[PDB]
Amino acid sequence: KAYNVTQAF
Amino acid sequence: KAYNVTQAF
Amino acid sequence: CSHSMRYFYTAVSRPGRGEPRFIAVGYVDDTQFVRFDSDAASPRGEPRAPWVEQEGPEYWDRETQKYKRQAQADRVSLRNLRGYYNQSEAGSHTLQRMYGCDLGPDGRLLRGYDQSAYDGKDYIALNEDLRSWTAADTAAQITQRKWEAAREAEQWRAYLEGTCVEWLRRYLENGKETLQRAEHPKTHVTHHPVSDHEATLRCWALGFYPAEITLTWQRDGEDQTQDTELVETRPAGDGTFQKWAAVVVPSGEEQRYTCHVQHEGLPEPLTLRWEP
Amino acid sequence: CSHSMRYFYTAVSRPGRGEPRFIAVGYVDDTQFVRFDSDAASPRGEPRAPWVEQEGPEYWDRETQKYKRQAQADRVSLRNLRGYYNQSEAGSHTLQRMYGCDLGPDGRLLRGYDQSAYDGKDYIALNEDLRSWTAADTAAQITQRKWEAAREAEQWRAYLEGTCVEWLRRYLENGKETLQRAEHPKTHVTHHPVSDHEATLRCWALGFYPAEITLTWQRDGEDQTQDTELVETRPAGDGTFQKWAAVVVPSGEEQRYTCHVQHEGLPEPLTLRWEP
Amino acid sequence: MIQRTPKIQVYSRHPAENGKSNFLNCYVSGFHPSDIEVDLLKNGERIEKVEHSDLSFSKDWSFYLLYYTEFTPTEKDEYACRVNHVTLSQPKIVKWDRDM
Amino acid sequence: MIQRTPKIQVYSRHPAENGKSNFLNCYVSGFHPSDIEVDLLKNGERIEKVEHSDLSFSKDWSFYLLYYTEFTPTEKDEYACRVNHVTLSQPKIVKWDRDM
């Protein structure tokens, strides 16, 4: 189950 | 004791 | 004993040739269970192991939506990174992220990961304490300052200690037949004359899972390392792995050499010789 | 038991900034005994170990003359290679050669080497039979055809089976106190809290020679690999080497972990624990 | 910017026996950047409908891919893997050897 | 053309004890091409007369060098290694840690 959309760099 | 000068490529 | 769930994201820009490609793959230990490719004919989160094929359409639609949003986010990231480095508009660049959770030998959370590379070099990484960051340069400290304001380590600690280990345990149970039953190597030794007085002994390990293995050669019980070659462990394509180790020996001394194999699927380490 | 003499040549072109630099270094096992640098203030073959300092000025003048001739030859080679690849005049390129002779566990010639790389990639290599070549591409087959007409493998077989092993044996005898007496590692284990429930155990090996070593971690006698870090073996600067291996463990279980050390200078493998 | 050339291994899924169906593998690894061209060859000619694994990478960030196709080895059919990459001036061919 | 970024290790020749003379080492390895800039820093400032080993390389053709200088560690003096290479956009600093 993937991380729920990361912050941009 | 090194090799006595190689042939060029 | 120990187990991991690990995700691998690759975003590749290609200026003048469309928007960046985003590829995600997810593993439990050495077994892939999911892929997403923004360049696929119909991009969707796709099952790659049988033990996620019963999760249902709701699960798969939600993973697909996350990947689509993640691809756009990685594209934003690639634009921000180009700005940090004052890089031209026309060059192609690569953003990689690896994250996930390692269960220790007790089956509890032992280590979480969240690390990234830009153009193949370390950029920023969540430290083992899951509270601090290692940034590679001044550009990465810009990213770190943004993430710190977002309480990024806290959010990642939450996922790593909760969702990640929860679903890892679920996957391990659903696929325990293939994920929690190590398959021992099948071994043999081959022989090749090299010259009129030397020969190669090659020690083979095939069909093993997980991929971790050690192969070593001995002579009269003494380690032989200076003239021993090891190939990289390689996938067989059926979920198992292969490796070999070769040593050159004086002809006539072959029976004196022993290959030693260590693998999780063996009860004890294995000792092998050439059988002529 | 086994020993090697190995030479490492690096030639680097720098168009518009002079003629290519040539650097040669020679080793017995992991101990350097000679250097030559065409960019040095006064280029000369120079001793780098005490057991070649009694060879006499005639020996050193002859090695120096060989290196000067070899530097010019590598410069010719770099020009020929640029032609083979239709490469521009302005780019810098790297030519590397490694050659030498490996004595086997019986002290007889076991393997000879003569392999080269261009810009960091395999180019041409003498095979283990010392009679055939592996060429990487069509450019390297041009070189191979020239060398075959010169009976290059025959000349290299002569050096590798004669001069190389003869002088390796002489160096091994003259420096047997430091080249034929393996120095065992000096070991210790350190402990660092990572969090309120996990800690790092770091297993150290210092002061050992030769460089080859293996460090592994176990828990209750069972191998621990998923969350173990190994640094590359590194030179201490005094002729010995250093390495460590770290594992993250649940706090309270440290006494259950054992570090295992294998090295030529140990009578048997070594088992270590943390001592609080 | 990193540029690493691929390591190449060509091998079968099971030890090759003439007339017994198998899979021919080309494993490319350790390369950067990610674009790479891999073909399996039968008697010098490109095999069509070769499949490959999904792009992944190792701890050191270098990429790896597996290319594979079903085949039945014979005594005289020759197989190889052909790879091109930005680090390669010409395509690199590695021949299949039954004991490597 | 290959381009590999250097691995960097900063460490002492012997376990550091305050007031006991030692050597400070910076080991750079695994890089290509061969040009590289390495400095040892004392409290952020470049140490002069640092020596280095003769350029050599490993089996995979990547280069390595050892830079070193004599020093007597104290409680508060901070040391580091600073490396630049064509693969690096800015010089990379690795701080000396007594147990690494």
Numbering used by the authors:
A (entry chain C), B (entry chain C): 1 to 9
C (entry chain A), D (entry chain A): 1 to 276
E (entry chain B), F (entry chain B): 0 to 99
What text comes from the article?
We also determine the structure of a TCR in the context of the HLA-C*12:02-KF9 complex, providing a prototype for the interaction of HLA-C with viral peptides. KF9-specific T cells are cytotoxic and suppress viral replication of both the ancestral and multiple VOC SARS-CoV-2.
We solved the first crystal structure of the HLA-C*12:02 molecule in complex with the KF9 peptide at a high resolution of 1.61 Å. The electron density was clear for the KF9 peptide in the antigen-binding cleft of HLA-C*12:02, which allowed an in-depth analysis of the peptide presentation. As a result, P1-Lys, P4-Asn, P5-Val, P7-Gln, and P8-Ala are solvent exposed and could be contacted by TCRs. The molecular characteristics of the HLA-C*12:02 B and F pockets fit well with the peptide binding motif of the closely related allomorph HLA-C*12:03 (one residue difference, Arg97 to Trp97), showing a preference for P2-Ala and P9-Val/Tyr/Phe/Met/Ile28. In addition, as the B pocket is shallow and would favour the binding of small side-chain residues, this could suggest that the SARS-CoV-1-derived KF9 homologous peptide, with a larger P2-Gln residue, might not bind stably to HLA-C*12:02.
